[PDB]
Write an enzyme that holds these catalytic residues in place. Structure first.
Site, PDB file in Angstrom:
ATOM      1  N   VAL A  80     -16.821  -3.911 -26.975  1.00  0.00           N
ATOM      2  CA  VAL A  80     -15.937  -4.730 -26.316  1.00  0.00           C
ATOM      3  C   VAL A  80     -15.683  -5.147 -24.889  1.00  0.00           C
ATOM      4  O   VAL A  80     -16.027  -6.475 -24.470  1.00  0.00           O
ATOM      5  CB  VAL A  80     -14.327  -4.333 -26.747  1.00  0.00           C
ATOM      6  CG1 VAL A  80     -13.158  -4.899 -25.859  1.00  0.00           C
ATOM      7  CG2 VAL A  80     -14.008  -4.950 -28.000  1.00  0.00           C
ATOM      8  N   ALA A  85     -12.050   1.810 -17.464  1.00  0.00           N
ATOM      9  CA  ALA A  85     -11.982   3.015 -16.448  1.00  0.00           C
ATOM     10  C   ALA A  85     -13.249   4.188 -16.547  1.00  0.00           C
ATOM     11  O   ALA A  85     -13.101   4.846 -17.236  1.00  0.00           O
ATOM     12  CB  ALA A  85     -10.760   3.442 -16.055  1.00  0.00           C
ATOM     13  N   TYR A  86     -14.197   3.948 -15.789  1.00  0.00           N
ATOM     14  CA  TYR A  86     -15.284   5.099 -15.932  1.00  0.00           C
ATOM     15  C   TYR A  86     -15.983   5.180 -17.168  1.00  0.00           C
ATOM     16  O   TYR A  86     -16.479   6.183 -17.484  1.00  0.00           O
ATOM     17  CB  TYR A  86     -14.758   6.594 -15.584  1.00  0.00           C
ATOM     18  CG  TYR A  86     -13.777   6.271 -14.271  1.00  0.00           C
ATOM     19  CD1 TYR A  86     -14.165   5.667 -12.836  1.00  0.00           C
ATOM     20  CD2 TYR A  86     -12.379   6.920 -14.548  1.00  0.00           C
ATOM     21  CE1 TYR A  86     -13.151   5.631 -11.867  1.00  0.00           C
ATOM     22  CE2 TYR A  86     -11.443   6.837 -13.255  1.00  0.00           C
ATOM     23  CZ  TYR A  86     -11.889   6.095 -12.022  1.00  0.00           C
ATOM     24  OH  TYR A  86     -10.986   5.992 -10.952  1.00  0.00           O
ATOM     25  N   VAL A 115     -15.968   0.570 -23.629  1.00  0.00           N
ATOM     26  CA  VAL A 115     -15.139   0.730 -24.525  1.00  0.00           C
ATOM     27  C   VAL A 115     -15.771  -0.098 -25.960  1.00  0.00           C
ATOM     28  O   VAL A 115     -16.537  -0.983 -25.817  1.00  0.00           O
ATOM     29  CB  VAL A 115     -13.623   0.017 -24.334  1.00  0.00           C
ATOM     30  CG1 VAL A 115     -12.849   0.248 -25.310  1.00  0.00           C
ATOM     31  CG2 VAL A 115     -13.195   0.627 -22.933  1.00  0.00           C
ATOM     32  N   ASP A 172      -4.330   2.266 -17.414  1.00  0.00           N
ATOM     33  CA  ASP A 172      -5.209   2.839 -16.243  1.00  0.00           C
ATOM     34  C   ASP A 172      -4.158   3.449 -15.062  1.00  0.00           C
ATOM     35  O   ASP A 172      -4.701   3.184 -13.934  1.00  0.00           O
ATOM     36  CB  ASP A 172      -5.964   1.586 -15.685  1.00  0.00           C
ATOM     37  CG  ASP A 172      -6.938   0.976 -16.698  1.00  0.00           C
ATOM     38  OD1 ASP A 172      -7.618   0.070 -16.379  1.00  0.00           O
ATOM     39  OD2 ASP A 172      -7.438   1.993 -17.421  1.00  0.00           O
TER      40      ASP A 172
HETATM   41  C1  LIG Z   1      -9.297  -2.724 -21.258  1.00  0.00           C
HETATM   42  N1  LIG Z   1      -9.071  -1.685 -22.197  1.00  0.00           N
HETATM   43  C2  LIG Z   1      -9.310  -0.296 -21.933  1.00  0.00           C
HETATM   44  O1  LIG Z   1      -9.783  -0.008 -20.769  1.00  0.00           O
HETATM   45  C3  LIG Z   1      -8.850   0.716 -22.633  1.00  0.00           C
HETATM   46  O2  LIG Z   1      -9.223   2.170 -22.141  1.00  0.00           O
HETATM   47  C4  LIG Z   1      -8.970   3.167 -22.846  1.00  0.00           C
HETATM   48  C5  LIG Z   1      -8.027   4.217 -22.835  1.00  0.00           C
HETATM   49  C6  LIG Z   1      -8.040   5.524 -23.492  1.00  0.00           C
HETATM   50  C7  LIG Z   1      -8.713   5.611 -24.241  1.00  0.00           C
HETATM   51  C8  LIG Z   1      -9.940   4.243 -24.699  1.00  0.00           C
HETATM   52  C9  LIG Z   1      -9.964   3.396 -23.934  1.00  0.00           C
HETATM   53  C10 LIG Z   1      -8.300   0.670 -23.840  1.00  0.00           C
HETATM   54  C11 LIG Z   1      -8.072  -0.657 -24.181  1.00  0.00           C
HETATM   55  C12 LIG Z   1      -7.451  -1.005 -25.537  1.00  0.00           C
HETATM   56  N2  LIG Z   1      -7.204  -2.352 -26.166  1.00  0.00           N
HETATM   57  C13 LIG Z   1      -7.739  -3.301 -25.136  1.00  0.00           C
HETATM   58  N3  LIG Z   1      -7.631  -4.542 -25.363  1.00  0.00           N
HETATM   59  C14 LIG Z   1      -7.996  -5.767 -24.838  1.00  0.00           C
HETATM   60  C15 LIG Z   1      -8.529  -6.820 -25.917  1.00  0.00           C
HETATM   61  C16 LIG Z   1      -9.047  -7.890 -24.937  1.00  0.00           C
HETATM   62  O3  LIG Z   1      -8.323  -8.478 -24.094  1.00  0.00           O
HETATM   63  C17 LIG Z   1      -7.753  -7.487 -22.962  1.00  0.00           C
HETATM   64  C18 LIG Z   1      -7.075  -6.129 -23.850  1.00  0.00           C
HETATM   65  N4  LIG Z   1      -8.245  -3.213 -24.020  1.00  0.00           N
HETATM   66  C19 LIG Z   1      -8.318  -1.787 -23.408  1.00  0.00           C
END
Ligand SMILES: Cn1c(=O)c(Oc2ccccc2)cc2cnc(NC3CCOCC3)nc21
Length: 347
Positions: free
Chosen positions: A27, A31-32, A35, A165
């Protein structure tokens, strides 16, 4: 027992996840770590799965991994990102090298919603209300987000909001005409002083204004330009705030600027709900000691139709004594391992 894991090359690395997680799809950047979206067959939820990159390559990295894990494990609030799962393919501490974090997949962030356009007043009420609800919760655990901005705010189809975050940027990415700096409180942007939780209330102010007008409030082309944009609106600091600027350097620079009075916010935000104007004035105060808090802002008349004192919960105590602790890599890695092993999934 330990679930069965399967391997699969995604992005550049080999991902090893439990069978329950299927249809993994790269996707974006988190952060670090990177995903993936996936389908969690146990819960029926679409999930975001982050694999951390070299979580234990240095003390700085090892502590950072422990910090994120500690923070995500604590947060149990509707308007705050929570941890659905955390896992490692490792069977022991000795073979422990990778950490995967799982949370809800979110549809869009606040950037995509604004899309150069004004939102209706009632949409703004609802979105800001939720941010402030999540912040009340976060702040009550003595956690500061430090970096609130539209891209840290994810929203689902119902306009239901989560904050991402929190509690965690290099000099280069804070340079120039960049969204990474536009939402920062001036005291933190220019390191004026040891800062508190109200840095985050300044950010909410910038976001709220952007939702009302459809335009960046302080689109500075650099640190100095942005400060000038800020002081034109809120006025130059008084003697009172100057005393509190502990940096002799910054205080000396501030004094060189021609004094400017605070502008009239009703003339800046034409056509806006007078109650929205009032709240903005209480949020966008230069002296951080005098800013409205999240708990206080929730009680403001602007949110009358959402506010419920009995449905705005606070957090359990959060022990962050580790922050001032100096440990070795293996020690941070062992602490991290204990936290993975002890994880209990939410209802
Ligand atoms: C950008 N991002 C993260 O950094 C993120 O970080 C995490 C934290 C804890 C565990 C795992 C991951 C989770 C996350 C979830 N959902 C969307 N949805 C996105 C779809 C596309 O549009 C923007 C939002 N983004 C996300």
């Amino acid at each position: 027992e330990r679930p069965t894991f399967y391997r699969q090359e995604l992005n550049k690395t080999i991902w090893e996840v439990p069978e329950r997680y299927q249809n993994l799809s790269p996707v974006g950047s988190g952060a670090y770590g990177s995903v993936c979206a996936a389908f969690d067959t146990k819960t029926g939820l679409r999930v975001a799965v982050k694999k951390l990159s070299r979580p234990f390559q240095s003390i700085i990295h090892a502590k950072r991994t422990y910090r994120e894990l500690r923070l995500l494990k604590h947060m149990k609030h509707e308007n705050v990102i929570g941890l659905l799962d955390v896992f490692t393919p490792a069977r022991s501490l000795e073979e422990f090298n990778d950490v995967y974090l799982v949370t809800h997949l979110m549809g869009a962030d606040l950037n995509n919603i604004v899309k150069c356009q004004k939102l209706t007043d009632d949409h703004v009420q609802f979105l800001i209300y939720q941010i402030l609800r999540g912040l009340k919760y976060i702040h009550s655990a003595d956690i500061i987000h430090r970096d609130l901005k539209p891209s840290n705010l994810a929203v689902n189809e119902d306009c239901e909001l989560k904050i991402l975050d929190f509690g965690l940027h290099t000099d280069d990415e804070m340079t120039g005409y960049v969204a990474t700096r536009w939402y920062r409180a001036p005291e933190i942007m220019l390191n004026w002083m040891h800062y508190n939780q109200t840095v985050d209330i300044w950010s909410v102010g910038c976001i709220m204004a952007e939702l009302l007008t459809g335009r960046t409030l302080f689109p500075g082309t650099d640190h100095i330009d942005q400060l000038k944009l800020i002081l034109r609106l809120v006025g130059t600091p008084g003697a009172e705030l100057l005393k509190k600027i502990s940096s002799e350097s910054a205080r000396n620079y501030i004094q060189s600027l021609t004094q400017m009075p605070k502008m009239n916010f009703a003339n800046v935000f034409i056509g806006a709900n007078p109650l929205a104007v009032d709240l903005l004035e209480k949020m966008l105060v230069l002296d951080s000691d005098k800013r409205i808090t999240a708990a206080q802002a929730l009680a403001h008349a602007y949110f009358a139709q959402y506010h419920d004192p009995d449905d705005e919960p606070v957090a359990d105590p959060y022990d962050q004594s580790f922050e001032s602790r100096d440990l070795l890599i293996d020690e941070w890695k062992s602490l991290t391992y204990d936290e993975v092993i002890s994880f209990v999934p939410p209802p």
